[PDB]
Q: What sequence folds into this?
C-alpha cells in the first residue's frame, strides 16, 4: 500500500506527460513560425520607402 | 508592456514619416519652382526699359 501511494505521488504518467511534451515542443515550433511570420513586415515597410 | 510603451514613445511610423517626407521634399521642389517663376519678371522690366 505504501509503495502504491509513493507511486501515486511520484509516478509519471508517461502517456500524459508525452502528450504534454509533444504538445509543448509543437508550441515551440508554433511560436517559432510566428516569429518567422512576424519578421516579414518591416521589409514591406521598405517597400513603403521604396 | 514596458518595451511596448517605450516603442510608443520612440517608434517611428515609417509610413507616416515617409508620407511626410515625400510631402516635404516635394514642397522643396515646389518652392524651388516658385523661385524659378519669381525670377522671370525682372526681364520683362527690361522689356519695359527696351
A:
Amino acid at each position: 500500500n505504501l509503495t502504491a501511494a509513493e507511486s501515486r505521488i511520484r509516478d509519471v504518467d508517461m502517456a500524459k506527460e508525452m502528450s504534454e511534451f509533444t504538445k509543448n515542443n509543437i508550441l515551440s515550433q508554433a511560436s517559432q513560425a510566428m516569429l518567422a511570420q512576424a519578421n516579414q513586415q518591416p521589409q514591406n515597410v521598405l517597400q513603403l520607402l521604396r
User: Anything to note?
Assistant: The CA atoms of residues 25 and 31 of chain B lie 10 Å apart. Chain B touches chain A through three residues (CB under 8 Å).
